[PDB]
Design a protein around this ligand. Structure first.
Ligand SMILES: C[C@@]1(c2ccccc2)C(=O)C([C@@H](c2ccccc2)c2ccc3ccccc3c2)=C1O
Ligand SMILES: [Zn+2]
Length: 223
């Protein structure tokens, strides 16, 4: 998160910190959010050979009793996810066990467009600048939902599939390490962080989760 503030600790109890493990390089990192006690929603580009999930974190470098480090037993990457266009960048992680509900850990389901100009909030442990590591503490930022023309320069952006997020006038943005984190508008999840520019100039592109709610429900019901 660039240009944000430190979250009040444990104020976003659905937030998931993901470590993405692959066989030929070091760990990479994503966000996500708990939508059922045994399912986390995140981005498909965060898939790996294995993934761990930490719930209940604030400062991710300091172990505490609120942490729940949970095994993922299966990754459900959207079957139409396209690595070239980045369409359908959405994935469900099924947890081995159900998370414990605590003050620090709870679910955020979302129901069955929010107009541009509205302000929304996104949180994450991602990089705080192009040349900076991920934040040790959960950060959040208020961003403007944009008209889709603001994201035209992402040639594969599509208004019905994706949200365009972050006024280009500001540095405020989701960034690398924040992928998969929820965008909340008036407390309701509307998007997850997908991609943006290497140089971090907003807007960034978020998956429009409303489009995917039927698919999410079909995975949840079969598993
Ligand atoms: C850390 C990283 C990652 C983490 C775990 C596994 C793989 C990659 C991840 O996310 C990305 C890419 C990306 C996005 C989409 C597809 C590939 C790479 C990215 C670049 C610019 C952005 C700008 C604004 C916000 C998010 C951005 C995300 C990574 O590199
Ligand atoms: Zn704590």
């Amino acid at each position: 998160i660039i240009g944000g503030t430190e979250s009040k600790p444990h104020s976003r109890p659905y937030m998931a910190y993901l470590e993405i493990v692959t066989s030929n390089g070091p760990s990479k990192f994503c966000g996500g959010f708990l939508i059922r006690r045994n399912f986390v929603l995140t981005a498909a580009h965060c898939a790996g050979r294995s993934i761990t999930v930490t719930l209940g974190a604030h400062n991710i470098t300091e172990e505490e009793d609120t942490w729940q480090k949970l095994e993922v037993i299966k990754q459900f990457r959207h079957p139409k996810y396209n690595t070239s266009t980045l369409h359908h960048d959405i994935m469900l992680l099924k947890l081995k066990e159900k998370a414990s509900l605590t003050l620090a850990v709870g679910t955020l389901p979302f129901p069955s467009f929010v107009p541009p100009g509205r302000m929304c909030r996104v949180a994450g442990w991602g990089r705080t600048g192009v040349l900076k590591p991920g934040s040790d503490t959960l950060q959040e930022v208020k961003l403007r939902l944009m008209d889709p023309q603001a994201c035209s320069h992402f040639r594969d952006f599509d208004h019905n599939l994706q949200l365009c997020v972050g006024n280009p006038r500001k540095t405020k943005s989701a960034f690398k390490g924040d992928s998969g984190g929820p965008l909340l508008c008036a407390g309701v999840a509307q998007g997850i962080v997908s991609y943006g520019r290497s140089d971090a100039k907003p807007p960034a592109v978020f998956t429009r989760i409303s489009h995917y709610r039927p698919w999410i429900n079909q995975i949840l019901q079969a598993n």
